[PDB]
Write a protein that binds this ligand. Sequence first.
Ligand code: FAD
Ligand code: CL
Length: 385
Amino acid sequence: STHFDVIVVGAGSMGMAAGYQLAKQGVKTLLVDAFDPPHTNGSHHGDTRIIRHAYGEGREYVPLALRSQELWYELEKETHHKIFTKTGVLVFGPKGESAFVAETMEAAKEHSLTVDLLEGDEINKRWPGITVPENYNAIFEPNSGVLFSENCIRAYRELAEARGAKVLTHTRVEDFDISPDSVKIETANGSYTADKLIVSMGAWNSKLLSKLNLDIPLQPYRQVVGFFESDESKYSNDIDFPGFMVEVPNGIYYGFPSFGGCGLKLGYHTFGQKIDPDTINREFGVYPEDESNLRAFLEEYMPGANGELKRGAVCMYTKTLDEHFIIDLHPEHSNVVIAAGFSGHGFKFSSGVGEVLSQLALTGKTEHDISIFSINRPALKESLQ
Ligand SMILES: *Cc1cc2c(cc1C)nc1c(=O)[nH]c(=O)nc-1n2C[C@H](O)[C@H](O)[C@H](O)COP(=O)(O)OP(=O)(O)OC[C@H]1O[C@@H](n2cnc3c(N)ncnc32)[C@H](O)[C@@H]1O
Ligand SMILES: [Cl-]
């Protein structure tokens, strides 16, 4: 017997930020999640996430990245949970052979971002512990860094709940009933109605958007990360070892300095197993590639960080065909907002995305330019049933 102004289905990275933005404005909000966020079944665990401003995936993301950065600094002041450490982020690759490095550089010039350019031995000299070939170049961004993702979601949840948002946990939404002036969700624990709906189910968008008559290629991937015992005199955040995202011959890798001796953390971005979010094996090490793809990079480029494996985590990406996000109104229902396909690089924007989703749900528009995320773009290959 409780109607809400807005219902958010999937209270993870994007949904919880939207919840916070809505509650902050006195909008009566219900957030429904299959688990109890933050948790380890979706796409936000593993402790840390890189935030970069000069953007190799595309200079068009810079404004949202800068706005999200300002929002993370705001969240830091609002909660007791740790949000952001300014490790700086290093990007490198073989000279003239990395579109990612090249666009990162173009993006920095175009938006007058503060960065250092260096190459070859200068990289190895500046950061003891990194060993790249002399034909590599790099762009270092000193003011970007690392977000503590589970902390972000927990903080947004606590702040939203304090302002009246309701969070219904361990409740899987199974179907939707959309009409011109209201929305309704169906779950085993009951059904709920509101004026607006935000759909942000992460990897499960690939299985449940068809319940909203949408047919968009969204492929979930199993992506692991490992924490390794390292030489702390070289890889500690305390001695300014940076976060990094780099391109080598076999693909892109990303990583984090050791924080409080937790060990250097590394992930291989280019490869992952195609999986289903309900049958993915969440145990690290069950595939030999889990650990060997990581050590292959470490022994070659960060040799002092290739010690004993201290911890592993398994998490998921949800890729669109062009690897750009989907943030838009449902093409047939202006009272339904969709947030999907973050393709392994959406967390850093979740604060800004929460803002965009709030604006779309409340007004049908946003002050942000989000055309590159249009649900109607051809490169997406979208359609209705
Ligand atoms: C996995 C991964 C991702 C990643 C990364 C490293 C790994 C191993 N490193 C990143 C980085 O350094 N920087 C960055 O900017 N991004 C990075 N990523 C990507 C980022 O984590 C993802 O793009 C982001 O987390 C996506 O957020 P989204 O909100 O889409 O996904 P979620 O946090 O998993 O939340 C979805 C929630 O919805 C719930 N759910 C699912 N189905 C239902 C149903 N049926 N009913 C109700 N709730 C549902 C989930 O339980 C989840 O909480
Ligand atoms: Cl993702």
